[PDB]
Structures are given as structure tokens and as C-alpha cells.
Amino acid sequence: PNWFNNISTDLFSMPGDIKLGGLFPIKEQSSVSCDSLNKDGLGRALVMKYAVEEINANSQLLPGVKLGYKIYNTCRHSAVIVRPALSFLTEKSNGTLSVECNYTDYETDMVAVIGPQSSEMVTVIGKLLGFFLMPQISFGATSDKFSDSLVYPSFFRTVPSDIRQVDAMVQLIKKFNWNWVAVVGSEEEYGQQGVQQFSKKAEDMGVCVAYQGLIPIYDDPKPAIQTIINNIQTTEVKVVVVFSLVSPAVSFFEEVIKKNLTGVWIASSSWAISDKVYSLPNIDSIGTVIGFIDETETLELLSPFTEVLFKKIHEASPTEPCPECWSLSPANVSLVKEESVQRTAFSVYAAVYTVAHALHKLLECNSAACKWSSSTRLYPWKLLEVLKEFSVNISNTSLKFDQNGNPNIGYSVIQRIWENQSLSSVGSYRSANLSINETLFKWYTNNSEKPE
Amino acid sequence: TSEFHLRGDYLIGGLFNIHYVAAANFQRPQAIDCSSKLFILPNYRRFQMMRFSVEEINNSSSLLPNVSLGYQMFDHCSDIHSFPGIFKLLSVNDLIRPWELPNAIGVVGPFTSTHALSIAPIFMTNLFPMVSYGCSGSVFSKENLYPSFLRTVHSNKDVINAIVGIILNFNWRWVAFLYSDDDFGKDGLEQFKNKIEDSEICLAFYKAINVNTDYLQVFKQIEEQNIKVIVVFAPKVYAEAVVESAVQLNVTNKVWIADDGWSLNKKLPSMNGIQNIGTVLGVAQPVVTIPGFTDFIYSAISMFCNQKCNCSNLSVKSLLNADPSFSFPVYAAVYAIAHALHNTLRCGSDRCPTVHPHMILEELKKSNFTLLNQTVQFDENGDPKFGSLSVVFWNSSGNAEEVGSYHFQSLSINKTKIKWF
Amino acid sequence: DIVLTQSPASLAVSLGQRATISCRASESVDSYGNSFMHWYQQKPGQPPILLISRASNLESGIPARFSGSGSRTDFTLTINPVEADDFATYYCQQTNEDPRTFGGGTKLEIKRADAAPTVSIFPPSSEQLTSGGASVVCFLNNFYPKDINVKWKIDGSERQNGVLNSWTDQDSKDSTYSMSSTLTLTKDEYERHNSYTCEATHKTSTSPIVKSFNRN
Amino acid sequence: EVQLQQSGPELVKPGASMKISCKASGYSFTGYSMNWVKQSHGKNLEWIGLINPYNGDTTYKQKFKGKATLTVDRSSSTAYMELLRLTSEDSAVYYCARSGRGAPTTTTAWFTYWGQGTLVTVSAAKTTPPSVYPLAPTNSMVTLGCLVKGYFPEPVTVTWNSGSLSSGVHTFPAVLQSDLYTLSSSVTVPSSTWPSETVTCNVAHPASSTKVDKKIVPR
Ligand SMILES: *[C@@H]1O[C@H](CO)[C@@H](O)[C@H](O)[C@H]1NC(C)=O
Ligand SMILES: *[C@@H]1O[C@H](CO)[C@@H](O)[C@H](O)[C@H]1NC(C)=O
Ligand SMILES: *[C@@H]1O[C@H](CO)[C@@H](O)[C@H](O)[C@H]1NC(C)=O
Ligand SMILES: *[C@@H]1O[C@H](CO)[C@@H](O)[C@H](O)[C@H]1NC(C)=O
Ligand SMILES: *[C@@H]1O[C@H](CO)[C@@H](O)[C@H](O)[C@H]1NC(C)=O
Ligand SMILES: *[C@@H]1O[C@H](CO)[C@@H](O)[C@H](O)[C@H]1NC(C)=O
Ligand SMILES: *[C@@H]1O[C@H](CO)[C@@H](O)[C@H](O)[C@H]1NC(C)=O
Ligand SMILES: *[C@@H]1O[C@H](CO)[C@@H](O)[C@H](O)[C@H]1NC(C)=O
Ligand SMILES: *[C@@H]1O[C@H](CO)[C@@H](O)[C@H](O)[C@H]1NC(C)=O
Ligand SMILES: *[C@@H]1O[C@H](CO)[C@@H](O)[C@H](O)[C@H]1NC(C)=O
Ligand SMILES: *[C@@H]1O[C@H](CO)[C@@H](O)[C@H](O)[C@H]1NC(C)=O
Ligand SMILES: *[C@@H]1O[C@H](CO)[C@@H](O)[C@H](O)[C@H]1NC(C)=O
Ligand SMILES: *[C@@H]1O[C@H](CO)[C@@H](O)[C@H](O)[C@H]1NC(C)=O
Ligand SMILES: *[C@@H]1O[C@H](CO)[C@@H](O)[C@H](O)[C@H]1NC(C)=O
Ligand SMILES: NC(=[NH2+])NCCC[C@H](N)C(=O)O
Ligand SMILES: NC(=[NH2+])NCCC[C@H](N)C(=O)O
Ligand SMILES: [Cl-]
Ligand code: NA
Ligand code: NA
């Protein structure tokens, strides 16, 4: 809290001796135009800023060596994100990518990659980065496709695999004696994968899926959405699992509210705590929403950091990823203090520290000196060798990465409470044991009892 | 003078997997020696088809007059390790500059949906045209996702429909769907499900399969669940795995439906005991004659990584009799790109007067020309408006006898021709 | 061709009790690890509704008071408890081999307490009289069981020619039957006599329920 | 909803031909066998055959070969069944029925959806409209009738007070005797509501285009 007034104003690009590449969805589309600010993704980007600043301010974690980074907008779009991904692979010295068959002696500009947020984006840069054996940690991408080290050789993850979240969802559903549900998802890797994962896991556990459905992320989602809701009505299902990205889910419930439909709603991490969903006029009418989020710590110092930083940024500007960002200010601390950000912020934090600590181990550092100088060359494939099944205590969390690149992070089962406009704690999911307290569940129904 | 290289005024890329190797952990950031791996005779043949198409066009004063076509070709047995040759085609003086006239103007290939999903995003970024001769993943019809992508084989949706046509033309309604444990096989599973949901066809069993699948137990379940129809949606390697294991385990009296990736397979029909597992049906690419390919091959049988075949002492007639599927798709691929360049230079057919690969893309989309009396065009997605499927039956002479046909906008089957085991 | 023989042909079961209908096939209808014997309910004037497929798989929307069992050549449908609208013909069906064949059917009646009919009689309308015809209608409404005897009487004399009868199907609410007895005469014949009697005898009573009118 | 809609009842001469239709909606027409079923009066179900609407393959029970022809029209999602050289034996109800999902063969398939049915009446007798007579008559309840006499062929529909009088209504099955049917319906209402509130017999005979209303008035 006193290293707080030395932190640089540089928001997306920070000079250092070893560099991390950052990939965040900072501005998306409402050639290729990226119009709209993602406030949650700007926030996660802020967490990596905070984490790096704090690591460097720690005099004994990478002693004598300054952590640096380049953060880039992904726009959740192929053409936008491959450009900075390729930029991570340019040689440190020459700022170019040479065409070659053996990159073992090749010194890249970044030693590791933090991000991207979305499983769609990982399928765009995963194998490229994987070929280079460049460590990439996702603070966000949950799809089980990335759990194969043979297909994604340098993939790591601070949040759990969705194979487990759907296990969490189906165990809950079994617990509540519901055998007739529907599954909805967004039409892209995340929702597509979850719907299949849920469907397969549902009937393995004897839950007859009455209907499945995908919501377009390109063109008009609304007509696909009515067919979805008609199938929901005609199957006469009370429980609908919405395994979907945030933007289409808003389009979805917009129409769900429109038909005064109710029932129980199962929420996936991606929208379970989105203000965009819950601020929908009359979303409280839709009934009961039960959710799943990654069980995370609360970064106690995030919000203060941001506040000194945002003052400093207001102080620094006017000067020349986020066009309008260096006009931000202490009023803008809403960004990191959003519940969406606060409860996922730890993922970004652990990603950066996980790399940070690995590097410490790579350079054989104790608390005063690192085996390092200006002639030290770092190849990503050496860092990867260290990160393999890496164990590390970050803050209060004991973090074990399995050989798939998956973490030992489970879930917290939550419920949406409308009259308060809040979320309560109704249980947990750690390992494959779902532990919920039936009594703590509130049931938005005619007589407040549970459906069925 | 390597087979993989050939200089020219404009370069077209060529992505092939001539060798095969199962995925394996690797500790270093470097290419794979594919040359010491398992040779694929049918892939090398398609490989040669590209070389023949370029030579044939080079022989022509009609198409690209006094403009030579060159190529950089690759054998990428692993999709993970293909990026050096990728970087080659997209580089300007063997440098990649991520923020900004490349070595090549377009690329033919790749063969595999898995190869495609791995590299295509890097190509799409600058509307660098890829024309696949093989990738059938239906995700590639979404043009916003893959803007400079086109192909000369149909989507999995179409082939899956034909397969379902075959199933419906008969009386069995329980089916096993065995599919390769990759994106191709998976997409096929999705499309198959999508197609039969509102149907008398009941998917009674399915399983992703690989070369190390416990085929013994896959087949006990199938039996105990009394399934007679076994659709196998898989490419050569995986197909031979299934079928070869089917013979070693007295699997008998089944109806096997093949897709066009193994219905004209050549190892399996001549295999000892194949006739004991029941009857083999399938959709096949109808054999298209490519005048002059035979002479070409006799002439050919006669560095940078993944550009070495290691395949001398190769029999010229093995090559020629290898499964000929995907021939015309390669053929039409090269010709497609050549025609697109011919029109971007605005050549007449006597002579030709700076080509950016996206300029190739717009003419590629507008493609409209005849080839072996076929019309070659694409829809606004990049999918081909040409090609058909024949329905074949494996008979007693080791031949895929043609017993019917499918046309993508209009099935017919002569059932007497099928002799059931 | 497989013959299905159902038993019993007819059956009456009180409300809330158990109905056991059986079906016997000439040959086995097993194949593919299943028994292709199905159960259908046909209500009067309606299409058959599929209750149970493959010997024992209950179909959507059909209450669990319907169930079945059996294999090879012996199959049973059970209805427990029986409810007021379950009167119908129940058919079994095999689809094991071509051609499909149906059992001759079992008719389930709802058994209830015996009830005597309410008996009304109607002289011809003046409208029919002009046509040259004359029907004397008798309604025998809401009785049980179905076995009833009607007799017409024109001046003490019993009349058998010209009598047409018709029963309704069992009633969905009160489980009774009704019947109509129409004696059609010529107007000349009808105006030839004076006293018309419709007399119904039923196990409910010793004595017949007689209903009469004088044409004058 | 899946629906199977059939043609209305037909009156057809001996030795003539007729074609029954089954408009299918609410599913993919070509994905399931359409089956046909004959039921005589003397209730027995009999399988005529099926057709595969994907290729038009047909399968028949032997006694209907050369007597029934199943066709389909994919552009209207209709199944057809033509009956030939009709005799009084073909006088029956016919059902179209769709096969279900779950069977291992098209042959083993069972019947989940049914048409409402098509009555076929094979006769040389000519269409006749009904005569509708009123059956008017001291208890709490009073019974009123309505005789529907001398029509051909089946069916007739009988309602009371435009359907408002449902409870206490018996409409009896027609009896045939001389190529004319006779139906009678009764209605039982309270003694006070009549003749205060008019009670009207509604009789409709489509085949002859007859819609007669009769009020029942006291004698
Ligand atoms: C930290 O900032 C303080 C004053 O805020 C200054 O004295 C000091 O030089 C800074 N420490 C550094 C740059 O290490
Ligand atoms: C930068 O350095 C590497 C070797 O250190 C070389 O391969 C590459 O071509 C250089 N970049 C240039 C020359 O632009
Ligand atoms: C790749 O380069 C490394 C480091 O120089 C070297 O040790 C190794 O031999 C090379 N691998 C090859 C040529 O396959
Ligand atoms: C910062 O806050 C102001 C108003 O408080 C707002 O206009 C501006 O858009 C904010 N910037 C963000 C949210 O990035
Ligand atoms: C984490 O904490 C545990 C318990 O305090 C300790 O035993 C272990 O050494 C730590 N692991 C690390 C620092 O990797
Ligand atoms: C939200 O309502 C819950 C009851 O579920 C309560 O426990 C919690 O304290 C409330 N939070 C508020 C009012 O901020
Ligand atoms: C479950 O919830 C109720 C809430 O009042 C509480 O009484 C009880 O202690 C809880 N049971 C547990 C945690 O086992
Ligand atoms: C060619 O491949 C074989 C294995 O198939 C290997 O033994 C041989 O050394 C290879 N020749 C080369 C790489 O020159
Ligand atoms: C092209 O022309 C040469 C003669 O220069 C001929 O030998 C060869 O067969 C031709 N190749 C083709 C048409 O592929
Ligand atoms: C033909 O092409 C050559 C290069 O291959 C060029 O030098 C020459 O000018 C051209 N000849 C013509 C157009 O007559
Ligand atoms: C193969 O044959 C053995 C007996 O010879 C039999 O027990 C087994 O079931 C057969 N396997 C099949 C049909 O898959
Ligand atoms: C394609 O080209 C032929 C002649 O090249 C022409 O007849 C045909 O109409 C064209 N089709 C189009 C432009 O769609
Ligand atoms: C098998 O098919 C081939 C190709 O159509 C045909 O020429 C040959 O006669 C067939 N052999 C048989 C039927 O044994
Ligand atoms: C159908 O098959 C038979 C038997 O092979 C053959 O003789 C006949 O030509 C075929 N019918 C056609 C092609 O119309
Ligand atoms: N909180 C969120 N909106 N998360 C969305 C990004 C991560 C998402 N689970 C994916 O795989 O794409
Ligand atoms: N391993 C394979 N996928 N081989 C077959 C390549 C061609 C196949 N149609 C595909 O799209 O993938
Ligand atoms: Cl992202
Ligand atoms: Na030329
Ligand atoms: Na495209």
C-alpha cells in the first residue's frame, strides 16, 4: 500500500526485463470495427496490471528483474487477435518473426501469455502458441477441449474445466428430483461444448434432455431464439440450463421475459453474475435462477490500487487497445468493483503470479538474487518445462495444475435474490463432490415451494 | 529439383499430409521429421495431382499465357507442427510482419478439417485465399468466420444426408455410428444427429474411435444391443482400424455404411476375411477421369522442413490404383486459383498484362469455368456447386460396384445389384 | 401370419378395482432383445390410442394406472385402478413380422350398481303424420346393466314388426347405458288403434316399467 | 403438434374406385412410414400396409394386394390410398397411422399417431336428406327427443341449443333398414326451464347439404 504511488500510469504496455503478453476482450463489435467497451474485460486487464505492479514492488519475488508486459485487445475476433499473438513471437532483439524450422534457440519477445478470456479465441491462437511451446494461461476460457496436452501443448487455466461444471449442474438437478430439462447455449465453442458436455453427462446420469439449442452470435439471434422458446414451452419444461455467453443470453431472456414464461434457470459462470442479464427490465419475473461460479479469493487491494492508479491516470493525461481509456479517473473505479470482476479477478491474479513464480524457479532465484543478467536468454519452452504440473501458493490458495493444465479450483453454487438484487451462498462444488444445503434455497414460485 | 518446389511468376501453396503419425508429447519448438513416418499412398497421389494440375496449366497458352505458376508444397503429418511452412507462404522475404505482397497468392489445401482449424485464422486475417480439396467441417460454411476460405468438396451436412438417404432406402432403423476422434468425425456425429432427430432412424450407439480404441468392447455392446447397421464416419487410418478389428473379432452379419473417405479404400476390399463381417455400402466420389495423369505419374516416379518424401522404390501401378477420391477436388482447386489470377491480371487468352492475395479471393468467389465438362462455381459461403455421390456396394471381385447415386439438389438405388452376405 | 387371441372378450370392472386383460400369440413375437407386442385403447368413434409399446414401455401422456408385461407369446395389460373413462376396446398388436396383426379385442365395461331406466314415451309428431308416417319413440335412459328387454303393446296386443332399437355406448360419468326404441307405423295404422304401451323389463325389478298414451 | 388429417366420409358405388387422403403436418414427412388400417363394423383392426414416403416403397398384407395402392405426394405431405373394385366388404372405417421412433426395423415399428379416420360407404343407394321430427311429451325433470329419419348415407351430427345443452344428452347410433338410416337423440332438462326457455334440435347432414333446426314445443 506504499508501493502504490510508484506504479506507472502506463496501462496496457509496461517496459520490463521479461515480458508477458496479455490478451483481453477490451473493445468488441456492438473492415472490422470494434466499437463497444467491455467493462469486465477492461477490469481483468486492470488485475494483470495490479498483479505485475505488485510483483515488481515485491523486492524478493523476482529480485533484480522487472516484469513487463503488452496487453492487446482481442475483440473476440480471429483477425484482430492473431495479430498480437503473432507479435508475441517476434524475436526480442529484431522485432520480427523469421521463418524457420527450429525455434529452440529463438528468443521471443514474450516468455508467456496471459489470456485470452474466451474459448473461441483459444481455438484461434492455441496451436500456433502451442507449437512455439509458449506458456499461455487463461484466466477465463473454460472449454474441456483445451484439457488435451496433445492438442494444446502449452495450455493452462486458472479456472476449472467445464466438464466439471456440467457435472456440478447435473448433480444439482439430480438432487432436486428433476429428470426433464432443456439445454441452451451460444453458437460458438463455449456454449457448443457445454451443451454437448451437459447432454452427454445428463443422460449418463439419467436426465432426459427434452431439447437443445444454439443462439447465433452473428446476424439476428431473435428468430433462432423464438424457436428455442417454443420448444421450451411445448416440451413443458420447468428447468432450462442456459450454458451461454453473456451477449446472446441477454437476447435470450429479453424474449423469455417477453412471453412471461417462468421456471427454474440454471446459470453458467459466464452469465451467472452478469449485471447485463439481471438489469433486464422484468427479469425478476422469470422465476428462480441458480448459478455456478468459480470459487475465488477476493483481491482486497484491487480497488485501492485502481483508485491511486486512476488518479495517477487522470493526473498523467492528456497524452497520446482502449482509445478512450486515458481519460479515465477516480470516478471510474466502478470498473474493478463490479461483482463480475471482483469474483473472477483472482483468476487473472493467479495466472500472472503463477508465471511470475515459475520464472523465479527458472532463474534459480532466492530472496535477494536471480541467476540472471542482460545476456540471459529466455525461451518459452524452458519455462513450460517448469510450469508442468506446477504447485504454488498464491495469496491464501494452494494451486495445483494437473497434467491437462487444469487447476484445483472448484465452484460456489449461488442463487439470484431479486428483492435484494443480490446473490446468496447455497453450497459448493469441490472435486466431484457437490455439497449444497437444500434449506437455503429460495423458490420464486406461487407458494414459495420448489417446482415438482 | 525437388518435387515440393517449383519456381514461377506466381506461387500457389500446397498443403498435404503425405505421411502419418499419431500425436505425441514433444519438448522442443521445432518441426517434425515426417519423412521417417508412415507413408500414405493415396495422399501422395493427390499430392501429385496438384503438381500435374500446375504443369498442365503451365503447358497452356490459353490459361495464364506466358505466366508461369509455381508452388511451395508441404507434407504436414502433424497440424501442430505445420506453422513453419505456413509462415513460408505468408512471409515477405521470409519475415512475418504481424501488423501490416507475400510469397504465395493462395493455397491449395489442407486435406483435413483439423489441419484447417489450426491455421486458417492466420490466413483469413488478410483474406489470403485457401482452397481446400478435403476439409468437410460444416463450420467452414460460416463465411464471417472463414472469409477467404473456399473448398471443392461438400460440407459434412451433404454427405451425412446421403448416408441417411441410404439408411432410409432400406428397412433398418437402429444404427451404430462409429466416428473418428477428430473434428471431422465429431462434426459428422453432430450432423448425423441433427438429420435423424425427426425420423424413424434411432441412433442406438456411437463412439469416437481412434487406432487404440478397445474395439473388442465397442463390438460387444453393439451386438448385445442387437444393432445391424454400423455407419463408420472415418478417414482411411481410423477406417482400417475399425474394419480390420471387425474381421479379427468374428463380427458378422452387419450392414456397414461407408462415407466417401473410405468407400473406395483399397486395402480393406482385398483383405482376408472381409466378406465375413457382412456387407459394405457407402457414398463415394464417382471416379472422374483425369486425362494425362497416368503418363504424368510414370514420369515422376522416375532442404526446408516437411519437403522430402523419402519414398523411392515406389511402384508406379500401386500409386495409380490407389484410392482416387479427392482427385477432381485437387484438380478443380488449382484450376480455380489459376482462373482467379488469370482474371485479376485481366489476361486475354493470347497474353497477360501487382497481385494481392485478396484480389485473388474476389475472382475465386466469382469462379465460373468448365473443367472436364463440369462447371466449377461456389456459393456465397465458399462451398462447391459441383460434384455428386455414387452409392457403391463392395462385391466379390473386391470392387466398389456402383448401385445408385445421390445429387445434392434434386437418391436412387438399384437394390438387386447388392448381394448380401 | 401370427394370430393374437385376447381374453376375455368382454369384462366389467368396478371403479377403483383391477382389470387384467391377456393376449396370446400363435408364435413368439420376440426379436432384437424385445417383445413386439403393443397395447391400444379404442374409445367409441375415436381412433385407437397407443398405451403401451414393446410389451411394457408406457407411452407419453398415458397414466401409470395402465401397465403391461409378458414376453414370447404371453402378454398382459393391467389397469389399476380402473377409472370411469377407461371403458373401451383394448387391442393388442404384434409387429414382430409381416404382416402386422391385431387381436380381436377386449371390451372393458365399467361395472357399477344396478340401475333401473328412466322411461319416456312419445306419440308421433304432427309433422310425421303429414308425411304419411308415424314413429312412436321410447327412451330408456340411464340404466345398468346393458341387458334389457323392450316390448311394444298396441291395445294389449304385442307388436314385433317395425321395432328398431339402439343402445348408446357406456356413459363417461355415471357408467350407465341408454337405449331408444322406435316403432314405426303408417299413419293409417297408427290412427287405427288408440293405446300404445312401451314396457321395459330389467333385472332391477320383478315388474316392468310401462309407459303409455292414448291417441285420444 | 403432429397431425394426421383425413378426407371426409365417402359414398361410393359398387365396382367403382375411390382415393383416401392423409394430410400430415408437424413433423418431417419423409422420415417415417405411413400405415393404413381397416376396421369393419364388428370391431377388428386390420393392417392394410405401409409406404415409405422417402422412396415410395410399399409393403402390403396379401389380401389387399391389387385392392389397395398407397402413394405419396411430397409437395403436399399427403399420403394416399386408392381402393379398387369396391364391394360392400370395403365398407369400413379406414385409418392412416404414422410409425413411431424406437423400433429396430420399419416392420417392427408401432403406431403412435392416427388419423381421425375415413368412413367408406359402398352402395348403389342415393343420397337422401333427413326428416327431423320433434319428440314432445309431471316430474322435476322432463325429457325431450328429436327423431332424425330417412337419410343416407352416414353421418349426421345432432346438437341441442347450438351445443349449450350437453349434460343429459343421449344421441343414439343410427339403425339401417331400407337403405335409409334412422337416428334419434334425447335431452333431459328441468320441468320449469321448459317450455319457458326454448329447446332446439340442431341436425346437420353434410352429404345432402341439410341444416335443419327444430324447436320442441308442447302438444
Ligand atoms: C518510490 O517513490 C518514492 C516517492 O514516492 C521515491 O522516493 C522512490 O524513488 C520510488 N522508488 C523507486 C523508484 O524504486
Ligand atoms: C533477428 O535475429 C535472428 C537471429 O538472431 C534472425 O533469424 C532474424 O532474421 C533477425 N531479423 C532480421 C535480420 O530482420
Ligand atoms: C534444434 O536446435 C537445437 C538447439 O540448437 C539443437 O540442439 C537441435 O539439434 C535442433 N533439432 C533438430 C535439428 O532437429
Ligand atoms: C468513467 O466515468 C464517466 C462518468 O462517471 C463515464 O462518462 C465514462 O464513460 C467512464 N469511463 C469508463 C466506464 O470507461
Ligand atoms: C503451500 O503451503 C503449504 C502449507 O502451509 C506448505 O506446506 C507448502 O510448502 C506450500 N507450497 C508451496 C509454497 O509451493
Ligand atoms: C440480500 O438478501 C439476502 C437474503 O438472501 C441477505 O442475507 C443479504 O444480507 C442481503 N444483502 C443486501 C441487502 O445487501
Ligand atoms: C442448512 O441450512 C439451514 C439454514 O437455516 C441451517 O439451519 C443448517 O445449519 C444447514 N445445515 C447444514 C449446513 O448442514
Ligand atoms: C525413410 O523412412 C524410413 C522409415 O519408414 C527410415 O527408416 C529411413 O531412414 C527414412 N529415410 C530417410 C529419412 O532418409
Ligand atoms: C506438359 O508438357 C510437357 C512437354 O513439354 C509434356 O511432356 C507433359 O506431358 C505435359 N504435362 C502435363 C500436360 O501435365
Ligand atoms: C513472356 O514471359 C517472359 C518471362 O517468362 C518475359 O520475359 C517475356 O517478355 C514474355 N514474352 C512475351 C510477352 O512475348
Ligand atoms: C465370436 O464367436 C464366439 C464363439 O465362436 C462367440 O462366443 C462370440 O459371441 C462371437 N463374437 C461376436 C458375435 O461378436
Ligand atoms: C457461368 O458461365 C457461363 C459461360 O462462361 C454462362 O453461360 C453462365 O450463365 C454463367 N453463370 C453465371 C454467371 O451464374
Ligand atoms: C464388381 O463390380 C465391378 C465394377 O462395377 C464389375 O465390373 C464386376 O463385374 C463386379 N464383380 C462381381 C459382381 O463379382
Ligand atoms: C438393376 O440391376 C440389375 C441387376 O444387376 C441390372 O441387370 C439392371 O440393368 C439394373 N436396372 C437398371 C440399370 O435400370
Ligand atoms: N464471465 C464471462 N463472461 N466469461 C466468458 C469468457 C469465458 C467463457 N467461459 C468461455 O469459455 O468463452
Ligand atoms: N484425418 C482426416 N480428417 N482425414 C480426412 C481428411 C478429409 C476429411 N473430409 C476432413 O474434412 O477432415
Ligand atoms: Cl478473449
Ligand atoms: Na500457362
Ligand atoms: Na467462406
Short mmCIF file of C-alpha atoms in Angstrom, two decimals, chain A residues 72 77-80 82-84 86-87 89-90 96-104 120 123-124 127-128 130-133 145 149-153 187 192 196 200 212 218 381 384-385, chain B residues 23-31 79-85 87-88 91 94-100 114 117-118 121-122 124-126 142 144-146 183 190 197 206 304-306:
data_model
loop_
_atom_site.label_atom_id
_atom_site.label_comp_id
_atom_site.label_asym_id
_atom_site.label_seq_id
_atom_site.Cartn_x
_atom_site.Cartn_y
_atom_site.Cartn_z
CA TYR A 72 -3.83 -6.33 -26.55
CA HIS A 77 -12.45 -11.96 -33.37
CA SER A 78 -9.94 -14.06 -35.39
CA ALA A 79 -8.46 -11.25 -37.48
CA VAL A 80 -7.94 -8.96 -34.58
CA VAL A 82 -3.88 -13.29 -34.40
CA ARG A 83 -2.04 -10.06 -34.99
CA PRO A 84 -0.89 -9.60 -31.34
CA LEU A 86 1.99 -13.37 -33.81
CA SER A 87 3.57 -10.22 -32.23
CA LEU A 89 6.53 -14.50 -31.30
CA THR A 90 8.75 -11.84 -32.89
CA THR A 96 10.42 -9.53 -36.45
CA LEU A 97 9.34 -13.10 -36.98
CA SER A 98 11.76 -15.08 -39.08
CA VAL A 99 10.57 -18.15 -40.96
CA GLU A 100 12.37 -21.15 -39.54
CA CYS A 101 12.12 -24.87 -38.83
CA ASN A 102 13.81 -24.95 -35.43
CA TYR A 103 12.81 -22.31 -32.85
CA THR A 104 14.74 -23.84 -29.95
CA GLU A 120 -13.39 -19.21 -29.07
CA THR A 123 -9.05 -22.16 -30.64
CA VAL A 124 -7.66 -19.30 -32.81
CA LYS A 127 -1.99 -24.32 -31.67
CA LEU A 128 0.21 -21.51 -33.00
CA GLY A 130 1.40 -24.39 -28.64
CA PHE A 131 3.82 -25.12 -31.48
CA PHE A 132 6.16 -22.49 -30.00
CA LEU A 133 5.62 -24.18 -26.63
CA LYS A 145 -11.30 -29.13 -25.47
CA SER A 149 -1.98 -31.53 -23.80
CA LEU A 150 -1.56 -33.47 -27.07
CA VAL A 151 -3.82 -30.92 -28.84
CA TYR A 152 -2.93 -27.79 -26.86
CA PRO A 153 0.63 -28.42 -25.60
CA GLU A 187 -23.39 -20.81 -31.02
CA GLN A 192 -21.45 -25.64 -28.15
CA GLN A 196 -22.69 -31.43 -25.62
CA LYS A 200 -23.81 -36.45 -22.56
CA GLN A 212 -31.11 -28.47 -27.09
CA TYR A 218 -23.67 -13.42 -35.85
CA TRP A 381 9.81 -23.97 -23.98
CA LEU A 384 6.92 -24.57 -19.96
CA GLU A 385 9.13 -27.37 -18.56
CA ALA B 23 0.02 -37.22 -31.86
CA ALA B 24 2.75 -37.38 -29.22
CA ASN B 25 4.20 -35.15 -26.50
CA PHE B 26 7.13 -33.00 -27.58
CA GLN B 27 9.62 -30.95 -25.55
CA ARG B 28 11.08 -28.73 -28.26
CA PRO B 29 9.74 -25.91 -30.54
CA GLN B 30 10.67 -27.30 -33.93
CA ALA B 31 9.28 -29.20 -36.92
CA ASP B 79 -1.13 -29.96 -37.69
CA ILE B 80 0.68 -28.59 -34.60
CA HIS B 81 3.98 -28.52 -36.46
CA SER B 82 2.83 -27.12 -39.81
CA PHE B 83 3.41 -23.46 -38.96
CA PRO B 84 6.93 -23.12 -40.41
CA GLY B 85 5.65 -23.87 -43.94
CA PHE B 87 4.91 -18.89 -42.26
CA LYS B 88 6.75 -19.58 -45.50
CA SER B 91 6.11 -14.25 -45.45
CA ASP B 94 10.97 -14.86 -45.04
CA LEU B 95 9.91 -12.33 -42.40
CA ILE B 96 6.47 -12.29 -40.79
CA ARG B 97 5.23 -8.80 -40.11
CA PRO B 98 2.04 -9.16 -37.98
CA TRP B 99 0.92 -5.52 -38.17
CA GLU B 100 0.85 -4.73 -41.92
CA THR B 114 -8.12 -30.42 -38.10
CA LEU B 117 -8.96 -25.09 -37.99
CA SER B 118 -5.34 -24.82 -36.78
CA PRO B 121 -7.38 -17.94 -38.83
CA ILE B 122 -3.88 -16.74 -39.83
CA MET B 124 -8.23 -15.28 -43.03
CA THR B 125 -6.73 -12.17 -41.47
CA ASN B 126 -5.60 -10.77 -44.78
CA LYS B 142 -19.94 -19.76 -41.98
CA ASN B 144 -17.86 -14.39 -41.44
CA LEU B 145 -15.73 -16.96 -39.59
CA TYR B 146 -13.78 -18.08 -42.66
CA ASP B 183 -13.11 -32.53 -35.66
CA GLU B 190 -23.34 -33.64 -34.92
CA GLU B 197 -33.89 -36.34 -34.95
CA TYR B 206 -21.98 -44.26 -31.00
CA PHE B 304 13.36 -26.69 -45.76
CA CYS B 305 11.40 -29.00 -43.42
CA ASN B 306 8.44 -31.13 -44.48
#
